[PDB]
Design a protein around this ligand. Structure first.
Ligand SMILES: CCNC(=O)NCc1ccccc1-c1cc(-c2cnc(NC(C)C)s2)nc(NCCN(C)C)n1
Length: 339
């Protein structure tokens, strides 16, 4: 059991083991606040997230469990993974705080694309790594659902990691038309739509579909990709969605070469494959990695899949204390990475 030191950072109290030195606020995280810290044990610069009211309700307790399970499962270079997880609590009875530890990253893609237009080689490498990371996440039957520039973290040497995958349930600019409108069934390719939007923005320096509401968002989308075809209309079970689509002004699919003028034709070809309205026709992460645009990076022997992931808990209806105890077992059973 380590020695814990107490401090206050922006009205919140942090009780962390002594190895975590020079805690400095970095901003808001998914369901809590994040601090940059120096880990004396590894010499790594780390990001520490203290979850906010982790067991206040069934909803909080289940998502705390969900995030910890996800983080403990992910072991890939382009996917955020767990370096450590701790609680100052000595017993389950006392258990009320969860601190999660991962690598501290240099910047987010949101702040990089404002400093400013990336070269085609830089786009190739960053998009490659997103798709490599999504290939792995998707292989464990996990979907991001809210992939966007603010959850893509990158270092000075251009190494990228995906954060906040598997947490979103139920940013609009990067959202697939089907997951926003609940038309079609939807699959893991909802993240590929997001990749397309991010890639377009990295290449042009401009948001591809900067909508104001769900209706304006669809309008902007259909202006590029065209109104749904007869083959796609056949696949819509929602009578509301169908009536609406058929009511809208018919729009043809624009030629992406005439939109993304100046861009590498291989980037334009990939975008055409990622920005397909029909979720069944959209390119997958594994297929996109073999696209000629990634010729200098693609390595089919270094594009791993994940071990299977047990998501059965998602279907369970348990009490706060049950979710809390399950989280406590996951905290105690944690094994840090090897050297
Ligand atoms: C399972 C998915 N969970 C997950 O990825 N958790 C992330 C996570 C897990 C355990 C410990 C820390 C984090 C965690 C780490 C970090 C950062 C690491 N390096 C950063 N550098 C700055 C300069 C860009 S931010 N940011 C966020 N939230 C950044 C803002 N988001 C988009 C709200 N959460």
């Amino acid at each position: 059991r380590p020695t814990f030191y107490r401090q206050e950072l922006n009205k919140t109290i942090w009780e962390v083991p002594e190895r975590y030195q020079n805690l400095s606020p970095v901003g808001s995280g998914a369901y809590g606040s994040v601090c940059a810290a120096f880990d004396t044990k590894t010499g790594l610069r780390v990001a520490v997230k203290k979850l906010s009211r982790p067991f206040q309700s069934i909803i909080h307790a289940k998502r705390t469990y969900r995030e910890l399970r996800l983080l403990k499962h992910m072991k890939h270079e382009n996917v955020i993974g767990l370096l450590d997880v701790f609680t100052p609590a000595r017993s389950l009875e006392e258990f009320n705080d969860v601190y999660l530890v991962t690598h501290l990253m240099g910047a987010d893609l949101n702040n990089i694309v404002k400093c400013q237009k990336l070269t085609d080689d830089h786009v190739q490498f960053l998009i490659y790594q997103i798709l490599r990371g999504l290939k792995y996440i998707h292989s464990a039957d996990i979907i991001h659902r809210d992939l966007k520039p603010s959850n893509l973290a990158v270092n000075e040497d251009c190494e990228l990691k995906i954060l906040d995958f598997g947490l979103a349930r139920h940013t609009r600019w990067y959202r697939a038309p089907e997951i926003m409108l609940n038309w079609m069934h939807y699959n893991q390719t909802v993240d590929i739509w997001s990749v397309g939007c991010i890639m377009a923005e990295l290449l042009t320096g401009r948001t591809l579909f900067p909508g104001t509401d769900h209706i304006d968002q669809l309008k902007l989308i259909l202006r590029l990709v065209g109104t749904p075809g007869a083959e796609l209309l056949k696949k819509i079970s929602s009578e509301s969605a169908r009536n609406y689509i058929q009511s809208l002004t018919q729009m043809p699919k624009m030629n992406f070469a005439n939109v993304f003028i100046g861009a590498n034709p291989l980037a334009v070809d990939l975008l055409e494959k990622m920005l397909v309205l029909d979720s069944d026709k959209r390119i997958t992460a594994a297929q996109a990695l073999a696209h000629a645009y990634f010729a200098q990076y693609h390595d089919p022997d270094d594009e791993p899949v994940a071990d299977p992931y047990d998501q059965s808990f998602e279907s369970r209806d348990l009490l706060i204390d049950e979710w809390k105890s399950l989280t406590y077992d996951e905290v105690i059973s944690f094994v840090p990475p090897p050297l």
